[PDB]
Amino acid sequence: YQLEKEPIVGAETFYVDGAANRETKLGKAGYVTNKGRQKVVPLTNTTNQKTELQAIYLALQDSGLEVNIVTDSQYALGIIQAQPDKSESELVNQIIEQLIKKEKVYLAWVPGNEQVDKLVSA
Amino acid sequence: YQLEKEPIVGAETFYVDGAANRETKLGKAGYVTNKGRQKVVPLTNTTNQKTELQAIYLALQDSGLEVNIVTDSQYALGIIQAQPDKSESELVNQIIEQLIKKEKVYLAWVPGGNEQVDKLVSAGI
């Protein structure tokens, strides 16, 4: 897989996000696209970091051969930009699988996303 | 397929809904379930009825061998209660395939969570 170097114009954009409870250990992973498409999946005994991976997997599954995805997660960006072969992470190997089956994917990090944010922090 | 007659204990209840712009033929379909799972899909060239039948389908697809669905569509209630074999609509045929796959499914009609879901399908129509 290759990552695009600039946005795909016309492709649907997913503002993926994810949150978890330190104490309850529960979370939400979801998204929101510029087409008004949406999704929230409550998670059990997870971590922020995994919710954010969860986020990015959701959007990879729901999307279309050419996609643009927007996280605020540095942790997920690094993994993906490294382009692993395989990982000991199951969730990761999954994403990895999803990226290989796409024609064009563009991912971007960012500090809209507040939309998905209110959403995930239930 | 056979419809249960009471809400199934232990199964997640899906509050399904759909809505379309009568002029633009723009619509949304989706659900909100008691476990906080949600979904909204943007639809093209559709009616209030196709939107509603789509909401059900989505629910059927995202749930598991046992499901409680609660709709406000009498339209969808009656096709589904009829226990059709086959129908002239693709959509419907897909719904059926799902119903058949399910272990247990209770479908109810209402005219709470159903409001959360309204607002969501309703935003942009």
Residue A107: both structure tokens together? 């991912």
List the end-to-end C-alpha distance of chain B, in Å, as a whole number: 34
Residue B24: both structure tokens together? 């633009």
Look at residues B12, B10, B44 and name the one whose alpha carbon lies nearest to residue B26. B44
Flag if B120 and A40 touch (Cβ within 8 Å): no
The answer to whether A117 is annotated as binding is yes
Listed by start position, the domains of chain B span 1-125
Q: Strands B26-33, B38-44: parallel, antiparallel or unpaired by DSSP?
A: antiparallel
CA separation for the pair B77, B53 (Å, rounded): 9
Cα angle, residue A118 at apex, residues A114 and A119 outer, rounded to 5°: 110
The answer to whether A6 is annotated as binding is no
Flag if A41 and B37 touch (Cβ within 8 Å): yes
Experiment type: X-ray
Alpha helices in B62-102 (DSSP H): 74-82, 90-101
CATH number assigned to the domain with residue range A1-122, chosen from the 4 options 3.40.190.10, 3.30.1330.10, 3.30.420.10, 3.60.21.10: 3.30.420.10
DSSP at B7: P
CATH number assigned to the domain with residue range B1-125, chosen from the 4 options 3.30.420.10, 3.90.180.10, 3.30.360.10, 3.30.1280.10: 3.30.420.10
Chain B interface disruption, residue of A41, A44, A118, most B CBs within 10 A: A41
Cα–Cα distance list, B46 to B23, B37, B42, B60, B111 (Å): 10, 25, 10, 20, 21
- All residues at 6 or more sequence positions from A104 whose CB lies less than 8 Å from its CB, including other chains: A4, A8, A11, A65, A66, A67
Q: What Å resolution does this PDB entry report?
A: 2.4
**Residue for token digits 């909100």?**
B32
CA separation for the pair B69, A26 (Å, rounded): 25
CA separation for the pair B43, A15 (Å, rounded): 20
CA separation for the pair A10, B18 (Å, rounded): 26
How distant is the alpha carbon of residue B42 from its chain centre? 15
- All residues at 6 or more sequence positions from B73 whose CB lies less than 8 Å from its CB, including other chains: B18, B49, B52, B53, B56, B109
**Residue B40 is nearest to which of A38, A41, A42, comparing CB atoms?**
A38
- All residues at 6 or more sequence positions from A15 whose CB lies less than 8 Å from its CB, including other chains: A31, A32, A33, A70, A112, A113, A115, A116
Residues of B in contact with A122 (CB under 8 A): 36
CB B26 within 8 A of CB B44: yes
Count other Cβ atoms within 10 Å, centred on residue A70. 25
- In A, what residues contact B, Cβ < 8 A? 28, 30, 35-42, 122
Q: Is B5 exposed, middle or buried, given 0-12, 13-18 or 19+ CB atoms closer than 10 A?
A: exposed
Flag if B28 and A35 touch (Cβ within 8 Å): no
Flag if B39 and A42 touch (Cβ within 8 Å): no
Flag if A41 and B40 touch (Cβ within 8 Å): no
The answer to whether B62 is annotated as binding is no
CB A47 within 8 A of CB B43: no
The answer to whether B12 is annotated as binding is no
